[PDB]
Amino acid sequence: EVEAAISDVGGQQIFSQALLNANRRGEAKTALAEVQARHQELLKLEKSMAELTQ
Amino acid sequence: IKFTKQSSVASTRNTLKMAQDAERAGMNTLGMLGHQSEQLNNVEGNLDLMKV
């Protein structure tokens, strides 16, 4: 007559992935992309003070 | 971005160095000017005595 055939229900697991804040944007965001123009200024101090020391 | 930061770090290093060296240059100039001021005070005293 009868027996077993399909059984369980209460039993499962799940992993979990993750995205990230957008503002993050490219690494260049404050104190990163400005270092290009901040360097020309610093080269200006170096120079103007080279005039100073000479 | 990293390379530009490295360039900034090197440039600030150089700036601090040669700024300190300028500090030295002016310092010894001032001590030297005080020395020569004292010598000129002596010159002035001798000239006054010579006028008398």
CB contact under 8 A, B4 and A39: yes
Q: Give the CA distances from residue A12 to residues A7, A8, A18, B35, in Å, rounded to whole numbers and listed in that order.
A: 13, 10, 20, 91
Q: Three-state DSSP class for B40?
A: helix
B11/A46 Cα distance (integer angstroms)? 7
CB contact under 8 A, B12 and A43: no
Q: Taking CA B37 as the corner, what is the angle to CA B34 and CA B38, rounded to the nearest 5 degrees?
A: 95
**Residue B15: closest CA among A19, A8, A31, A45:** A45
- Structure determination method: cryo-EM
Q: Is the CB of A53 inside 8 Å of chain B's CB atoms? A: yes
Question: Which of B2, B6, B16, B18 is the best residue to mutate to test the A interface, defined by the most A CB atoms within 10 Å of its own CB?
Answer: B18
Instruction: Give the containing element (helix H, strand E) for B24.
Output: helix B2-51
Q: What is the resolution of this structure in A?
A: 3.9
A40/B33 Cα distance (integer angstroms)? 37
- Write the single-letter amino acid at B9: V
Q: Is the CB of A47 inside 8 Å of chain B's CB atoms? A: no
